[PDB]
Amino acid sequence: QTSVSPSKVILPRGGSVLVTCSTSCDQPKLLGIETPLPKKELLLPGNNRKVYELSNVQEDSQPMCYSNCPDGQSTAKTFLTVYWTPERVELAPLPSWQPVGKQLTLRCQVEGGAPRAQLTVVLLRGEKELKREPAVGEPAEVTTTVLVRRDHHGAQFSCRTELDLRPQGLELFENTSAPYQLQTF
Amino acid sequence: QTSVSPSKVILPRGGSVLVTCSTSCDQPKLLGIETPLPKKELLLPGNNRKVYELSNVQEDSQPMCYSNCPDGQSTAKTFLTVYWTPERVELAPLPSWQPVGKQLTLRCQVEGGAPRAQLTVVLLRGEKELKREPAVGEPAEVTTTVLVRRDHHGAQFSCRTELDLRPQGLELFENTSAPYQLQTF
Ligand SMILES: *[C@@H]1O[C@H](CO)[C@@H](O)[C@H](O)[C@H]1NC(C)=O
Numbered sequence: 001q002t003s004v005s006p007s008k009v010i011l012p013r014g015g016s017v018l019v020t021c022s023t024s025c026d027q028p029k030l031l032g033i034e035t036p037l038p039k040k041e042l043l044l045p046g047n048n049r050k051v052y053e054l055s056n057v058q059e060d061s062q063p064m065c066y067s068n069c070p071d072g073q074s075t076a077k078t079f080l081t082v083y084w085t086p087e088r089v090e091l092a093p094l095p096s097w098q099p100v101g102k103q104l105t106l107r108c109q110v111e112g113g114a115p116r117a118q119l120t121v122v123l124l125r126g127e128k129e130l131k132r133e134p135a136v137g138e139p140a141e142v143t144t145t146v147l148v149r150r151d152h153h154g155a156q157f158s159c160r161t162e163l164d165l166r167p168q169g170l171e172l173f174e175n176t177s178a179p180y181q182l183q184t185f
Numbered sequence: 186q187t188s189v190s191p192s193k194v195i196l197p198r199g200g201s202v203l204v205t206c207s208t209s210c211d212q213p214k215l216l217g218i219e220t221p222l223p224k225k226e227l228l229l230p231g232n233n234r235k236v237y238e239l240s241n242v243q244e245d246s247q248p249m250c251y252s253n254c255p256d257g258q259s260t261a262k263t264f265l266t267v268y269w270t271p272e273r274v275e276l277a278p279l280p281s282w283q284p285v286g287k288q289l290t291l292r293c294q295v296e297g298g299a300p301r302a303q304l305t306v307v308l309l310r311g312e313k314e315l316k317r318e319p320a321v322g323e324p325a326e327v328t329t330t331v332l333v334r335r336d337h338h339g340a341q342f343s344c345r346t347e348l349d350l351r352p353q354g355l356e357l358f359e360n361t362s363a364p365y366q367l368q369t370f
């Protein structure tokens with residue numbers, strides 16, 4: 001009965017997408033789409049198929065097509081996913097002066113970023129990875145202890161986010177905070 | 186000036202896709218698309234934007250939008266890629282009886298399959314991989330020698346193709362030939 005194409009779509013936050021609602025029955029009494037998103041109707045055969053441009057999609061949504069055929073009423077849902085890199089990625093303020101032999105805690109804060117299911121927050125010592133974790137909460141915080149050694153000198157520590165959309169057909173988008181320099185003694 | 190969305194698309198062989206040709210200039214003297222593909226024109230503002238449904242795309246194509254603005258004439262191309270698993274995947278006919286201690290050659294033939302840039306042909310001994318190679322030519326052949334040992338008994342050999350579209354946002358589609366049993370002595 002009812003069908004929608006694409007059934008799944010990934011688009012940048014605030015973007016637009018074309019959705020086609022279709023129905024296989026001879027005489028559709030009604031065919032349309034239910035969604036609160038700003039919409040515009042275009043024209044194909046008009047009757048068995050309808051095309052809509054959904055615009056300024058700010059967050060995930062599942063618009064659904066529908067058609068009332070004489071045989072029965074059915075629906076078809078399309079899942080829209082919006083992406084955007086974090087609006088802010090920084091390490092919580094930490095004293096520059098740090099006691100040798102004592103423990104220090106790094107805390108990264110990531111505000112925003114979606115889809116969260118593909119966003120990872122990582123803490124680094126120079127170019128080395130210290131911790132990796134899925135981004136959870138708002139802001140998404142990630143923490144780790146670091147035993148201050150003399151080895152830790154002009155070691156710059158940083159936080160990085162990885163929005164990996166490659167499995168969706170796009171790319172990995174990375175972001176980095178300002179570095180933190182450990183001044184010991 | 187001219188723009189096209191999507192600028193790149195991957196679709197199954199014989200499928201359809203919606204293409205929107207746009208132009209940023211005030212008064213476009215002309216706006217359209219050049220492509221030999223079966224097309225249908227839908228309607229958005231009509232003037233600065235036009236939508237077309239390209240149908241039954243059988244092979245890769247690069248339809249281009251165009252617009253003649255007073256400022257100048259420009260173009261924008263969209264690259265369409267069609268996919269389809271091989272129409273046939275089999276090992277060249279080989280005698281069932283095979284001399285111990287002598288060399289045997291396996292030869293897989295893969296007819297079709299696209300995009301070829303993501304199709305790999307692999308030869309296997311049971312579930313073990315013996316050879317892997319990008320699919321080249323038509324039919325795409327892949328060969329390997331196998332030193333017949335007594336170890337090679339009711340060893341079934343097979344050929345598999347991997348159409349890896351995961352980097353495009355889809356999945357890996359696999360195909361396998363009939364197995365070949367080595368009857369020695
Ligand atoms: C994050 O990286 C994107 C590109 O990947 C860039 O456009 C954006 O400005 C960066 N965001 C921040 C907060 O630095």
Ligand SMILES: *[C@@H]1O[C@H](CO)[C@@H](O)[C@H](O)[C@H]1NC(C)=O
Binds near residue numbers: 271272273274359361
């Ligand atoms: C190859 O696999 C696809 C699904 O991945 C299947 O639909 C098709 O029939 C297979 N082709 C052959 C020749 O077996």
